[PDB]
Design a protein around this ligand. Sequence first.
Ligand SMILES: CCCCCCCCCCC(CCCCCCCCCC)(CO[C@H]1O[C@@H](CO)[C@H](O[C@@H]2O[C@@H](CO)[C@H](O)[C@@H](O)[C@@H]2O)[C@@H](O)[C@@H]1O)CO[C@H]1O[C@@H](CO)[C@H](O[C@@H]2O[C@@H](CO)[C@H](O)[C@@H](O)[C@@H]2O)[C@@H](O)[C@H]1O
Lengths: 86, 367, 577, 75, 257, 601
Amino acid sequence: IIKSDINIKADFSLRNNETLVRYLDYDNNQLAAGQNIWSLKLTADYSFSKNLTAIFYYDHSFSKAVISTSFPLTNIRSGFTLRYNF
Amino acid sequence: DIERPITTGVPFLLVAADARAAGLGDQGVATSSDVFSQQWNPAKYAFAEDAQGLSISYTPYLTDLANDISLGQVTYYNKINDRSAFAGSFRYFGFGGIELRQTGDPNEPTREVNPNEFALDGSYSLKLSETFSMAVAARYIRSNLKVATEEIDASAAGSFAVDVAGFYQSEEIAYSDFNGRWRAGFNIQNLGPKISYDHDDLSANFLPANLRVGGGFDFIFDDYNKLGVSLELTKLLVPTPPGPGTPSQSQADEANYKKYKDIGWVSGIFKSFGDAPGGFSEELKEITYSAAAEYMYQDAFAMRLGYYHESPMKGAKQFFSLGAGFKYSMIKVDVSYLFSASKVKNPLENTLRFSLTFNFGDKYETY
Amino acid sequence: LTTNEYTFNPQLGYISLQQRLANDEILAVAFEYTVGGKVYQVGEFGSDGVDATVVTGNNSSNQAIITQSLVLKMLKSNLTNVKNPVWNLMMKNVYQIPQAYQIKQDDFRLNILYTDPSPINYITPVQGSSFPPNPAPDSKVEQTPLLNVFNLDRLNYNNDPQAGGDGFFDYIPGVTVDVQNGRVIFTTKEPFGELIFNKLQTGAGESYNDPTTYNANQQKYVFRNMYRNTQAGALQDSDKNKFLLRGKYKSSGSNGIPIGAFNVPQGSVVVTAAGRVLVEGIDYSVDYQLGRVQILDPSLQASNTPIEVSLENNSIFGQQTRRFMGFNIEHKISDKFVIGGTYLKMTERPFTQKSTYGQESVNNTIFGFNGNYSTEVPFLTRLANKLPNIDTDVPSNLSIRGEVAFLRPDAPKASDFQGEATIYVDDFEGSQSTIDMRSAYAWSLASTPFITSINDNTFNANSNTLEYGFKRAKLSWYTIDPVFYSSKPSGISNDDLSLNTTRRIYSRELYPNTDIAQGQIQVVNTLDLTYYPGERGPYNNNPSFGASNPSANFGGIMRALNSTNFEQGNVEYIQFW
Amino acid sequence: EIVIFPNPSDGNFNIGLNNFNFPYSLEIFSFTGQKVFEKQNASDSIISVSYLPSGIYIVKIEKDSKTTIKKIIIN
Amino acid sequence: IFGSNTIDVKPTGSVEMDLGVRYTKQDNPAFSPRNRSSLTFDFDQRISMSLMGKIGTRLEVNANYDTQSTFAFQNLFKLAYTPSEDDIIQKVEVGNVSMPLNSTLIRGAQSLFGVKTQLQFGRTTITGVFSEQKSQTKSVVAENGGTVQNFDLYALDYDNDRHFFLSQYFRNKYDVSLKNYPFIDSRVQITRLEVWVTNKQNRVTTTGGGNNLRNIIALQDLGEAQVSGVPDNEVVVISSTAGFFNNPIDSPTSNTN
Amino acid sequence: TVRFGALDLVRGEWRRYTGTLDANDQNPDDDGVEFDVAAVNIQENGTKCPVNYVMPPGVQREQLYNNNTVINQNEQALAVRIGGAGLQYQDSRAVFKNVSVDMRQYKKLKMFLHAESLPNQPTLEDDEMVGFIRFGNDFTQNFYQVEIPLKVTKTGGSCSISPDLVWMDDNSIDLALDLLTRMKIKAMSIDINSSKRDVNGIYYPDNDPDLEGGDGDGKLTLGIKGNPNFGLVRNLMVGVKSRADHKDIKGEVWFNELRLADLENKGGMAAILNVDTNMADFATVSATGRKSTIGFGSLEQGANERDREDVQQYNIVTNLNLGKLLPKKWGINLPFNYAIGEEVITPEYDPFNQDIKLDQLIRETTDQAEKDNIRTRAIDYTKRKSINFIGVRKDRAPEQKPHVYDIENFTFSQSYNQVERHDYEVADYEDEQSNSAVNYAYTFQPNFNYLPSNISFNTNILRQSNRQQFREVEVEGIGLDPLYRRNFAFNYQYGFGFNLTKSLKLNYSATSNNIVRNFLNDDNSPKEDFNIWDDYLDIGTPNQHAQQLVLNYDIPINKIPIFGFVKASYSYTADYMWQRSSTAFSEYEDPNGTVYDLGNT
Ligand SMILES: CCCCCCCCCCC(CCCCCCCCCC)(CO[C@H]1O[C@@H](CO)[C@H](O[C@@H]2O[C@@H](CO)[C@H](O)[C@@H](O)[C@@H]2O)[C@@H](O)[C@@H]1O)CO[C@H]1O[C@@H](CO)[C@H](O[C@@H]2O[C@@H](CO)[C@H](O)[C@@H](O)[C@@H]2O)[C@@H](O)[C@H]1O
């Protein structure tokens, strides 16, 4: 009785950043700073009616530590969003 | 000022979460059946006029300062038969997202935390007689207000509670000048084991066990106008902490507090009626009251006025409340405002509470 | 520092930083300058200084690294010492005009006044004495404005020299004014110090560096301690901070008057030009979205008249709840005569029952009676028609509006102490702030200490060998992790958690009178230091450690302090429970 | 961007301005909505409000037309 | 009491409601094992509703509730009950009311929340209000355009720890050089200057003017010669100045001094 | 095992005052007196050994809402401990604070004091320790001192002592500020070197044998030194002094709830009258008269924000359309604006001494010259006058051919503003400003073309004269020498554009500012007897001159049918500026006496 399209959008990102300090006269390649963050955002839209719609969202981001001053961080925000228009 | 207030865990359970009852002076135990009748009296869910109902309610804190610091509520009721109803409510007090950062790095993955407190409850209401109904509710309360750091554990504190409610709605009785209707209600709620925020059996806090008894009357004019006046009395079922001393100098207070904290909740419910140097006259100071009048026009416009008074020696929360309700086709919108009359700054001042309910399904005749 | 982080005066040889160094920061400089055809250098630049590193050898097993330092000039030291000449390098004649960014001439007024106790812009000699006789024209003190006394007024509008000045502050963008940052710089390095001392000097027996030789006029007016001492230290010289730099500046930015508010209610803006209220459609216009007021009256634009704009801004934050009540009568005697009887009351509800100074609440009442009478006067029209070349028929009108108002103010009954309206100058609950030191991870192993003086060899702190660490006994500093109390780890019993050295401390025990919000932390995370004097500490190579007296050993931790200026912060004591 | 040094602080924290026009207005508000801290002509990064009782506080930073509201924790 | 029974109070806009879970895991070894991860519940509301209509051709309802902006002046709610013009009561306003006064000595209030009523006795108009005021009065003074800002500093309130003389030579030349300002009796032209501070950021970046980190030794007495009117102990900290100087008594500051 | 339940570096708002408060000692960094200042709390010091901390009688804890919970706020008192050697006979130790407090609207200053003996030390007896508040502009020259001998709370037994006995009413300071005002008035007649003053220069009426009633307070001892001002308190000090002759006293004193009480809430009156008339679209008169008394204000104004002044102001603004007095055939737009007005302000408090009522000071003077000086110097009088002829133009005829020599291209604007003032800071203030502007603007309508497309040219004559004479507040005998600022200027900028070719475009403009220096002598001495209309149409010496020139050329190379695709476009902006140097440069003089011209820029 209820039939509608399902719209899915997926966004994956992977960003690596590195900062090296190099000495010319001897091997002293110093790792000054660094980042390695990969994120994934899934969203799925389903329209129950002309006014009521549901959106399933799933964000999953992981930041790996390159230098010890930063800690690995995992963030997962998942769930549903109901929107009703008038 | 306040003299020895009753301290309980998760006090946000006592905050009114909907605009309809907010406009009626924070009472709903004996008002007409509505979708928000879960925090106040689930027993009238069996008296609901509509089959199915959903409701979203918003109470902002620090309205001017910042958003996302609010108490939201989602309620859904469904009466399968003429005699029974299943309801489910979810109250969520939250501060929104908070970013934790220790270094000034522009590129730094930081931790976003949302301290919160939510209660998810489900109630079954069964109509015993044609005018009386009972209800049993089970509630799970979870508190995650603290933030994980060093030497601090942010493990959420959980607890369970049971609510027993009863609602009586008389038939429409004709009088000399009108044909009104009588209502009564009682609710003993938040009955459960103590909640330990530190996850230790030595340190625990009483759940805000509450007893609410109320009664109301509707004057019905021309069959299209209603005026309902309701009065509710509320009493906490938690023992009052000792004051000066009831046996060195600090040792008496230490012994009194040790005796008070070593009391079971089941025994604490019965101990609440007394356990003070004062008598019955001072015992009546433990009861807060609320009186409201709600005018209904065409069953689609509602103008609600209410007055809520606590004892000046505890809580000190007295105010007047205004509320407006509009039903367009199947959607009811309620707005509530509060004028405080107490010396302590009410955090709900200058706050317009919002409530929005949708009703769907077939209609049930009212008796 | 990047060139964006500082500026400098190429002629007067001083620098101004974007970020001030109110801490133990070290400031070093290298600069080269030209005097005519001569070039002088004082520091050591990165282009002409020694190389940062010199490496000798081919492989890391036998390489030698030589890290070389640049020789610079010290402007601020690691440790503050007001008796060293490096302290004198810090300028104390620059004053930052608050919230000023682009001060310009004709839009900046500055005056120097002497408040004792009222603002007076000249200096009187102390009773029983007089200012030095026959002074130079540039050294006049008696009956002289303080702009001339402190060498800030010797030029006219066009910066041309004038005999006694034009009475206005001299605006030189390179000498007395920093335009881009809104700073005022005195023409002397110590205007309130040696300059006023020289103005009041009567003989060679008075030395500015010897306060005991002052002549009872330098004893009153020479505030030397603001230059020879820190500002917190100069606070101890109370009778001298009487000179006041009082002024104003015009902030425009763009066209229109910035009323300092956005999306203001319509009809809440009242504009008064010279005691008369203007008309919102004729004399001025209001841009409510952008919060602008544009004066449309041509006479007022070229008037230099102060215009007062009073609006109502509803972007209020942290304000008490104010109740506004009252009535207004609008009786109509005739079709052109109206009488009004407005009465209003505004009460404020304080957050607490104590009102501190400045954060006060009002309970004001205002009631008034007004009368309006607007008529049409054909006589004026007929008189106008009698004029040579006037033949108009537009009616002439008269209007008289009288009004009387009475204000009865009061304070709310909530903020009364024993029946009287009370304002707390100091209830003493805001004093004595604390800086927490019991964070376990902030402490590290300490160096060997001296116990009476730098010459005391008790714990072998003066040793340059391994004996330096011979007296270090074992010490552990920690906070017992909540896993021991909540989720009992294997091998830990309940007897292990009840010893007064391992048991969990609750705030209700240490602070029985303190109220904690429900859901917050009810436990006290104590900093536990377990000291074993009979056990060998880290990096201790004592051949006979167990054969010595354990009471002669030490166990220590050290910590860095974020705020190093105890005098400015008024760090009063170390308090520990 | 506005940066707040350790969010669960004891009352002593810092601001993370990006080396712009230094005069900014800082206002710290309690959960009651009361005004508990004012700071105009502000340029010092370190903020000492450790006399405030524990809880969450709202920090408003006004920098020219820029307005920012952040939440901090005092524990 | 009402003109009719038609109730066309219609709501427009949208309402959003997010229910989900937030899982966070930070691998900080100093954290407790109980703080390994945090699994909380996210509940969010984005009410963006308007409500406009009439009740019985007598009540006008205008409401706007938007939980995405400042509630001080955006969330609006007005009920206006206007009976027939022949009645004693002309208007009853509930919610966002205003109290406009055609007065100069007594200013009315525009942004209020409360009850406003109006009565008409033949020729007398009585307007009563009881509300809470949602704004504050702000006054500015402007001359020749922009507003006037007043400042009052004291002598002790100088801009400290921000302004530094480059040398004792410049400090002792400052007063004499500015004797006849705006003319400066000095030919000094600072052509190049490098400034070094204590590094506590410990951040390496190529866009911040490059990575220029050097070991630094800063001497207090570097580049200082004697001064004619200042004793040596006020110019240098060196304990013994015997043989320290090798330049005349008024030489400009230089490395060879 | 040592467990720190708390470990803090505690910093205070009240700074320990170093330096002698008594002239008999004159060596503060000695005597071996340990002087400590800290705080005592209800949350931390409820079990204190000598006396447990309790709130003063009638004082309650503040209550707030943290999260739906009522939190009792901490109650704190400032504790001052004197130990070791002890205070000498007249020595005192105190803490201080920098404030900005106006207490002119409150009648009482109240504060709780408590005294106790140090444990394991000789007992402190009653009336030996004296608690004092010293407030004013400083602590050594200009201050009120309020002293009270302290009754000592008896100890030895139980640590818990009732609040009525911890904070005795005999130790509570309850000062009437009119007593301070009367002390100030009485000390006005006391010489600085008088024998009635102490070694510290403080005048105590209680110690005056020739004064009846003393300071008017039987419990407090009041003193004054140097004309302080409680209308603006910049320095506040609380401390302990000794009165034991042959004894060194030791003990701890608590200070609590320093507050102002008994607000003066007499209202105020205001009246406003407006007469607005218009006369046949030719005349418009607007007269306003306001008169407000002391105490009036707005609803939102606080105790120190309401009007402490009597204001009597009027303002008449008149607009005429003089162009309508001429026939409409040749239309002239000649509006004339005349705005006169003045305000007189009488302060509630005399501007001198800043804290005594003007009428009270006038009554208790007994010298006609001094009364006249006070009344005249108190008044703040302002007067403004403005004459405006802005917008003088001749409108175009309904059917007229535009011409370059037409008078319709000219616009005239005259403005004259005069401000007279005299107040507590200026005995006489003149501010004149005359601006005359003539604007010309014509645009043309349809080897290379030499006809300009448009020509613009405007001239300005700005003259500002400001005479400022500061008053001698002490006597109206001489006053200060008047200071003159004059800004006579003549400005003119013109501009014109050419369209020599369909591609070329040449916009030129030149601005010039000259300064008129006819008010100066041969030396750098202004002339007092000068009128702003002396030589109005005088062009002064050049001061600044700027030229701007813009060339745009589309380079029509497309004419040659080999380069028809090139779309070249050349723009050339040229700026020149000449700035006159200050006279300190153009006539700089060496110490040798020779004069050099340093030139312009
Ligand atoms: C646990 C709760 C789960 C959530 C319950 C959602 C119920 C959704 C039902 C849609 C509804 C309620 C409106 C609720 C909106 C509130 C949204 C809140 C937003 C938050 C921010 C809207 O129906 C109304 O709205 C209009 C839409 O604008 C409809 O238009 C049209 O709508 C479409 C034709 O229906 C067209 O396709 C569309 O083209 C048109 O436009 C109209 O039909 C009608 O006016 C009508 O209810 C009806 O649908 C069924 C569905 O099977 C419900 O079945 C129930 O499901 C369980 C109940 O959950 C019960 O257990 C179960 O026994 C029971 O069989 C019944 O109730 C039934 O009566």
